[PDB]
Design a protein around this ligand. Structure first.
Ligand SMILES: O=N[O-]
Ligand SMILES: O=N[O-]
Ligand SMILES: O=N[O-]
Ligand SMILES: O=N[O-]
Ligand SMILES: O=N[O-]
Ligand SMILES: O=N[O-]
Ligand SMILES: O=N[O-]
Ligand SMILES: O=N[O-]
Ligand SMILES: O=N[O-]
Ligand SMILES: O=N[O-]
Ligand SMILES: O=N[O-]
Ligand SMILES: O=N[O-]
Ligand SMILES: O=N[O-]
Ligand SMILES: O=N[O-]
Ligand SMILES: O=N[O-]
Ligand SMILES: O=N[O-]
Ligand SMILES: O=N[O-]
Ligand SMILES: O=N[O-]
Ligand SMILES: [Cu+2]
Ligand SMILES: [Cu+2]
Ligand SMILES: [Cu+2]
Ligand SMILES: [Cu+2]
Ligand SMILES: [Cu+2]
Ligand SMILES: [Cu+2]
Lengths: 332, 332, 332
């Protein structure tokens, strides 16, 4: 009887940060209660000032990472305030039935709903809006995130030994399709209905105009670079709700990678780059061995360095000259 | 001596259905005899009435699924009737030598040929036409299918335990490249030779105009939706002869997935989405747990919902409120 | 103390050939010394005579395959002669720290540098140039290769048994983005600086104009076809520094494949086609069973047969009619 289970309310945080949780479950199964408020908002996505009408869960692109354990129940209160204009819903790839919840969560502006589902499979999973007839438009306007369902005994390596992370980050990668005129400049629009056919035309090109981490070019850089220390074990969850990506840590590796995100499978070891298919979340575990700046990229390097799919880690600590050294510095 | 082996004649069926077979081999190795007749035909591929000149094995896009067991011999009689205009052949990715058979099976209109090969590797494999100098044109005109080579003791899970499906479906996904003029409308053509250079130009864009299951937008919907019941174990074989795809069952999972289709490998567990590379067939096994409508899609959602790569399952049975429920239905 | 280790100087060879090495390490850890000289040069990449300004390591696209064992040190002397015009560097995906070495290896024309790093992870890995602000331009101008870090006890299969190759080839696959005018003809340019913005524009299309093996359409054909004999065990290392590929041996298989290239993982068995993500090297092992011509392709068949991503094997030996035969040759 679900009513006899503990309830715990989670307060979500903005990506790339992740709400506090325990890797190894410290309680039995629980109903884990989340609330998200949909926000349609203008977002500047590049250094040129290109502004789009984003559709968000909780104000961010991506939406926040939710974290539960296997066989917990996820109870989500989804709020669509009357300041929004569109119908929205939510589909969890972690859930079973009713189009992942989408069939049960259609909320007009001024409405809310509560969905409960049992998290029966461990892994990282995409969630996204998916209103009938409008699915890719909502998803490619930012309106996707991820949920991590941890095994109750935490992560394990390929031999069944524990893998415990010290830090976790969530990198949502977003493909945008900003409509272009025949000279190639972006268009804007006066209403969502007036934008819709050219959004469809732009999407049909299958060529994103921007591919960004955490909602904008450069979002994971400078003061907002990811951080770690030498010797820290870091889990990076990476999702892409619509298009393949190939993450790579420049100067590092994925020591243990679940490229398609499902923890019942043994991880792939020692990866340089891995393929996360569109519509999937993946997770990579790495122990830093060197300080300095790293770039975390989609290793289509055009996508990374021209379209925006690049962020930075700043890592503190001691340099290891055994691992790498300049024997002769550049010189004439 | 192959002449001492039993022969069995298979009568093929139209996708997404699959000819009757046994999962666990009930006989020793056999020569399994198949016949396919090539048909060049007009096909309407979308709701707008866009009509192409399709090139088919057995009248369908995809061609039918052939099913044998490991170390059977596949004997195919391939017929190119004189009502066709082009040279065709067949290449089996399951076979070894002679470009998969393509070098031995070149048939002008009015010709036939018989090829035999030993199915030495278990898995699902693409087959496709591949005439020298014209390969992608034939393949992207529909002229591909798949063959399943079952292990003699049937499918097994990651622990070596049997996996037995109750139903099997074959979803062939087809990328079409319908030539467009500079305003973006499709062109038609008066002969294959007159179409060829613009087919090549259209293909060179690397941007399909349509991506469909079972030969047309909506083919696997309505009266032709896939069906199952709660508790049924379903195997979905999915092929793509030319371009990557990322299947996903909306509201479900791939409980056991051979993404690259080869049964000697342990399956990946609990997949949300999986990557089937172009030129591969994959297979996913799922036990339905909830009734209702599911969408089975390529989870590039633009490809699914704008270009055609979406079908439906209709599932009968009892709803499980433990797995999912609406706690509070959408309301003001 | 690294100075107490043996040093061995390797003399590199042009792809697709690979410098001599031992699969099982015959010495303890060593410092393996390599030298590469950067060459900017004109290269004709297609049958039409399209000529680009290539950026190369050691005069070739791809750069040469380097081979070491796990826990060897790689010491590379990188020379940028004063006959070049651009700044270059090198990033090894095999290395840890300093952006794979790129932060330590920036060489103006007329400069050289020496980098040492410990090869701590076994596998095949990409290396590429990556000058800050110019990364995809250099990589997509050819300026990438691979390094193989063998386990000290050589390759092993999924059961831990040895896999020993008789021959090894390195296929580098290169995506080029040759700028096109509005009629679709290639442009040329008078200086690298004058080419840069249109190179960026061309790259931003995400649509390669050419995808080639060993630097040009047809490079691995005719007198330069790959060769083998029936019964030979062949390892094909395949890299793609920027874009996904899906190799396939037409008429054969990948008997053992490390699609993402890392030897600590068990190989995938019996592959028809496999996905090597952009920014990765993979490796496939096959034992030839039939003589004749094979095509080795990227199985996006448009990429293979229209854009250039196809080569040939010529295999000598005895035909096996048990594996494949023409029962009835094509006839009326
Ligand atoms: O707890 N049954 O999924
Ligand atoms: O943090 N425990 O390994
Ligand atoms: O055609 N101008 O969007
Ligand atoms: O091209 N990725 O969906
Ligand atoms: O199939 N491209 O997303
Ligand atoms: O989904 N397993 O990485
Ligand atoms: O039966 N030998 O492949
Ligand atoms: O249908 N036997 O599990
Ligand atoms: O340029 N009209 O196909
Ligand atoms: O983009 N798939 O071949
Ligand atoms: O590489 N795209 O099929
Ligand atoms: O090919 N193994 O999924
Ligand atoms: O030898 N330590 O990587
Ligand atoms: O070449 N030894 O298997
Ligand atoms: O617009 N001509 O490159
Ligand atoms: O489409 N491959 O990066
Ligand atoms: O994501 N295409 O390389
Ligand atoms: O990276 N393992 O193929
Ligand atoms: Cu929405
Ligand atoms: Cu989805
Ligand atoms: Cu044909
Ligand atoms: Cu093929
Ligand atoms: Cu360079
Ligand atoms: Cu790189």
């Amino acid at each position: 009887d679900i009513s006899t289970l503990p309830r715990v309310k989670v307060d979500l945080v903005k990506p790339p940060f992740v709400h506090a949780h325990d890797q190894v479950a410290k309680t039995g199964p629980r109903v884990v209660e989340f609330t998200m408020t949909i926000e349609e908002k203008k977002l500047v996505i590049d250094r040129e000032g290109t502004e789009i009408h984003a559709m968000t869960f909780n104000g961010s692109v991506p939406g926040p990472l939710m974290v539960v354990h296997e066989n917990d129940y996820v109870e989500l209160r989804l709020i669509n305030p009357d300041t929004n204009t569109l119908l929205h819903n939510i589909d969890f790839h972690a859930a079973t039935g009713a189009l992942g919840g989408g069939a049960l969560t259609q909320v007009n502006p001024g409405e809310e709903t509560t969905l409960r589902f049992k998290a029966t499979k461990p892994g990282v999973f995409v969630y996204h809006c998916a209103p009938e007839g409008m699915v890719p438009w909502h998803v490619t306007s930012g309106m996707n995130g991820a949920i991590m369902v941890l095994p109750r005994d935490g992560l394990k390596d390929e031999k069944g030994q524990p893998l415990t992370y010290d830090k976790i980050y969530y990198v949502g990668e977003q493909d945008f399709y900003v409509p272009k005129d025949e000279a190639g400049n972006y268009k804007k629009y006066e209403t969502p209905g007036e934008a819709y056919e050219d959004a469809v035309k732009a999407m049909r090109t299958l060529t994103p105009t921007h591919i960004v981490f955490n909602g904008a070019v450069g979002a994971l850089t400078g003061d907002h670079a990811l951080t770690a220390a030498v010797g820290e074990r870091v889990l990076v969850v990476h999702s892409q709700a619509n298009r393949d990506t190939r993450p790579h840590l420049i100067g590092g590796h994925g020591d243990y990678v679940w490229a398609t995100g499902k923890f019942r499978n043994p991880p792939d070891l020692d990866q340089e780059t891995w393929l996360i298919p569109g519509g999937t979340a993946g997770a990579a575990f790495y122990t830093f061995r060197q300080p300095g700046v790293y770039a975390y990229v989609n290793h289509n390097l055009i996508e990374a360095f021209e379209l925006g799919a690049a962020g930075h880690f700043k890592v503190t600590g001691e340099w290891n000259d055994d691992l790498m050294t300049s024997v002769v510095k550049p010189a004439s």
